[PDB]
């Protein structure tokens, strides 16, 4: 029953789950500055994906499918590469959560982390 | 065991699941043009949420938590309303899926649908 990395890659990109065996770079591409690239994750999170120590503390901010379509600004664009469903939005952190300060520190660690990789 | 609408509202906004009993407007606010508002869903999808006939065909495009953090451009902004985790990205439709044409029609039905509500 244990899935191979190849089996994990069969999922459409938006449904993939990164792990140590099939990591963020492998599932989602290198981190970088371009619009088409993801910018989130330090070297530890990139190499570990959902096996990362603080994954549950990151995932608490990810939207359910209902919320993704409920909260976001959704669009459609046709380009040479194909037809794309575009999305933007924002998620409010709970500054009454006693973990607020740690959540900010955690998110900041990963945002644009690639800029200081050795 | 059946959850009340009040119980559904206890979830953080990004984790809510809209249904007929706790619908898109109730969970996620009115549709509209502002940056802070969602723009997706016709009257049927708004009133039904995940009970909508074509929900599975919409949800196939929503990201897993790993993909949401892997694919998107993530940021943090502090405003008067609080601290926000910002996100943008795009999801490619599979133009080899025999359902492609129907997926485009479906998404277009819901994008900015509020503009033609009676």
Curated annotation (Swiss-Prot), chains A, B:
Motif Nuclear localization signal per record, residues: 10-18
Localisation: Virion; Host cytoplasm; Secreted; Host extracellular space
Origin: domain of life: Viruses
Domain CoV N CTD: 1-118
Biological role stated in the UniProt entry: Packages the positive strand viral genome RNA into a helical ribonucleocapsid (RNP) and plays a fundamental role during virion assembly through its interactions with the viral genome and membrane protein M. Plays an important role in enhancing the efficiency of subgenomic viral RNA transcription as well as viral replication. Attenuates the stress granules formation by reducing host G3BP1 access to host mRNAs under stress conditions.
Subunit structure: Homodimer, homotetramer, homooligomer with RNA. Both monomeric and oligomeric forms interact with RNA. Interacts with protein M. Interacts with protein E. Interacts with NSP3; this interaction serves to tether the genome to the newly translated replicase-transcriptase complex at a very early stage of infection. Interacts with host NLRP3 and ABHD8; these interactions disrupt the association between NLRP3 and ABHD8, increasing NLRP3 stability, ultimately leading to increased inflammasome activation.
Protein name: Nucleoprotein
């Amino acid at each position: 029953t244990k899935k191979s990395a190849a089996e994990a890659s069969k999922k459409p990109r938006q449904k993939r789950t990164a792990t140590k065996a099939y990591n963020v770079t492998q599932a989602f591409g290198r981190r970088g500055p371009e619009q088409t690239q993801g910018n989130f994750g330090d070297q530890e999170l990139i190499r570990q994906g959902t096996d990362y120590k603080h994954w549950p503390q990151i995932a608490q901010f990810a939207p359910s499918a209902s919320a993704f379509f409920g909260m976001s600004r959704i669009g459609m664009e046709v380009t040479p590469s194909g037809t794309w469903l575009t999305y933007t939005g924002a998620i409010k952190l709970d500054d009454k959560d006693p973990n607020f300060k740690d959540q900010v520190i955690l998110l900041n660690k990963h945002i644009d982390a690639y800029k200081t990789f050795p």
